[PDB]
Subunit: 210 residues, 3 copies
């Protein structure tokens, strides 16, 4: 028979999750019916979650998405275990953003473009563009950054205001420290602000169809 | 309660889209129930759209998919804004194919393999294979081309009859002009014709299950 | 009207598939409602299939997933044609694992991480981690291997106990023979066993929600 389900659901009971949690989603955010949002997740105001995105906070938790951010088609957010079966927090898998602990922290005015992925432990600072098919894992991406399409940040801290060229896989802190800077003449210098404006308007337009 | 929705839908009203449009889909095309097709989209005859694909024509529009083409699992089609909020067409984000304007143009007998992405402005010429996990953005891919798995074309024109080796990210016109040619002994020389034959038969078989 | 469908379905009748087959899924496996599983597929015990995964055995068949393996969000399994329209088996597109023929063979205790893809003909040996956004096509990956995020294996045999560095695309047997070995001090040496433990527990937790 037809597959009947809820796409916004609590996470399952496991040895590291005694008490199930359901997503906390601002009334102004739009969650596409063909997106999936599971578990201990906070979604801020004016956020657009597109078809085929999967936000799954059932292993490492919590997963936060700030105000006016977007999670585009096929994007995945997931995280390594943050608390072991013996009730001990796995500090290496927990990110600290302003005195609060997260598995994945997506800041405000952040664009996660189509088919990208941010896997915890990870943090992405405000007004950053994570390009199409890009990857972030075990990293902290600063504010006002640009990850071009197919770039990746693994095990590093990307300083504020830097970009990663298309296709480059950054795996060492020495490499991350030498990334190029966003300047006004850089091709993606204005991309994130335009994308956030478009996506905040799409969230409202789609909300008016539900 | 269960998530109830239509997977083939009109696009939302926004400042660049006063009048919503619904997809125009040929009766011989097959759209999987777990694919999403939104907005100002034209889908040609005998096209197969597989599970988890997302064709979203709500920002840049229109998005065209020609006859006997295929949009495989997890493929995304989306596009940059083609008309600003002041009603002016953004010509840099509009592609011209035979005297008609598109955000994304996918030609006839084109295969978009699993997890690939074509982001407008972009055009993909007839009888071209866009490989698994490949990426096309701000580019024109000619006819009878092959993008091997994990290749990418960004900001360039790929001449007719050329291929991009697996994993290569092409970002300059000088690089695109020097791509290798498809010859009969090239490993993917016959791939697209076989894939189109298989996919046209799958579209019909799946249509017979609906 | 709302899109009503079954996400676990038989494959379509085609010239290479006279008699449709439906998936054989162990009662202990968990198939997310937003995953798709089509055709001649065998899923073993304690397997977790996550949101937006697509397992499609309608071209090359069969597709096997062994016990205690996981198919994470947005993963695709598909395969090249294994039998032509003249009823002849295409031996180059068929993989042999223990005296049985498969289009795609995923062994036991194998992790297919988010957005990865394994395209037949292909085999992945037991206790192997296929990282985030990785790709396997026309290859045999041995047991106890690690494909780091964004790595790829195309047209090769990856010897048992080896790893592929993040972002590396391996397309020649000479390259595959020289891959580095997994040792206890290697960063991903314990990853797969932890991931399988977590995923077997998630499968059970999610089963308790259905
Ligand atoms: Co994960
Ligand atoms: Co887009
Ligand atoms: Co395929």
């Amino acid at each position: 028979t037809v597959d009947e389900f809820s796409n916004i659901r609590e996470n399952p009971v496991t040895p590291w999750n005694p008490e199930p949690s359901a997503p906390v989603i601002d009334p102004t955010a739009y969650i596409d019916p063909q997106a999936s949002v599971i578990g201990e997740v906070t979604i801020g105001a004016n956020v657009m979650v597109s078809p085929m995105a999967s936000i799954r906070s059932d292993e490492g938790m919590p997963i936060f998405v700030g105000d006016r951010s977007n999670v585009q088609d096929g994007v995945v957010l997931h995280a390594l275990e943050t608390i072991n079966e013996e009730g001990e927090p796995i500090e290496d898998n927990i990110v600290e953003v302003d005195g609060k602990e997260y598995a994945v922290y997506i800041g405000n005015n952040v664009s996660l473009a189509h088919q990208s992925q941010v896997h915890g432990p990870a943090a992405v600072g405000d007004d950053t563009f994570i390009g199409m098919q890009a990857f972030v894992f075990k990293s902290k991406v600063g504010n006002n950054c640009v990850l071009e399409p197919r770039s990746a940040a693994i095990g590093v801290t990307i300083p504020d205001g830097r970009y990663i060229p298309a296709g480059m896989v950054v795996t060492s802190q020495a490499e991350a420290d030498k990334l190029p800077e966003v300047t006004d003449d850089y091709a993606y210098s204005h991309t994130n602000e335009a994308v956030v404006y478009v996506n905040v308007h799409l969230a409202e337009g789609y909300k008016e169809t539900s």
